[PDB]
């Protein structure tokens, strides 16, 4: 459901996911959920994890999403021959490098943040871990 409201272009090349991540220090809240694996996340996965976190703290607290997709995935339909043009877009993804902080939370106890993030970690295709506020 998280989706760019307008884009410069329709499509994008496939590209690669080589290297490590930037958004590494916990910079907004008290607790953070960080990627360990390497891959890509859909908007459905991001929204479902957000719903899991907001379920666990029920409403209260403030939650940051440090990621946003801004990359489409083109998908040729069922039973279309190869070639004849690049396919249409059906879902948007975010590029994930390891060490990327994904989610961030402030205003709750540590054990509650810890269990909320382990609820949302099963919603995700990769291994994720728990980080605190640092310097």
């Amino acid at each position: 459901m998280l989706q760019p409201k307008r884009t410069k272009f329709r499509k994008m090349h496939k590209g690669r996911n080589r290297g490590l991540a930037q958004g590494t220090d916990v910079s907004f809240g008290s607790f953070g959920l960080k990627a360990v694996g390497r891959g890509r996340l859909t908007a459905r996965q991001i929204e479902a994890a957000r719903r899991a976190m907001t379920r666990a703290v029920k409403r209260q607290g403030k939650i940051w999403i440090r990621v946003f997709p801004d990359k489409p995935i083109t998908e040729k339909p069922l039973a279309v021959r190869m070639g004849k043009g690049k396919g249409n877009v059906e879902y948007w993804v975010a590029l994930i490098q390891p060490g990327k902080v994904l989610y961030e939370m402030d205003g709750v106890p540590e054990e509650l943040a810890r269990e909320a993030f382990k609820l949302a970690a099963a919603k995700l295709p990769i291994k994720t871990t728990f980080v605190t506020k640092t310097v």
Binding site: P98, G99, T129
Partner: protein, 94 residues
């Protein structure tokens, strides 16, 4: 308060640095002021267990190297991304 025992990097570069990290040491460097900077290899688990204390980022830190005792303060740190460990520290002279 804090006193850090340390050796001297005789080789520098990423090959020696990654050998040194895999040998459960890690490098750092002291700079700032009038002297030419000083590069240090030092033990990992010691300072990794030090730095969780909040006083580590506030107080003045003494370091033993060559017998010489140097008073510094911590400035910035290259933390590793996903494991809970460290790579490199920038220390500032007093």
């Amino acid at each position: 308060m804090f006193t850090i025992n340390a050796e001297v990097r005789k080789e520098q570069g990423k090959g020696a640095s990654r050998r040194l990290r895999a040998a459960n040491k890690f490098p750092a460097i002291i700079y700032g002021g009038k002297e030419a900077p000083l590069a240090i290899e030092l033990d990992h688990d010691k300072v990794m267990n030090m730095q969780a204390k909040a006083e580590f980022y506030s107080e003045v830190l003494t370091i033993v190297v060559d017998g010489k005792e140097i008073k510094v303060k911590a400035q910035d740190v290259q933390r590793h991304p996903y494991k809970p460990k460290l790579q490199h520290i920038d220390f500032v002279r007093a």
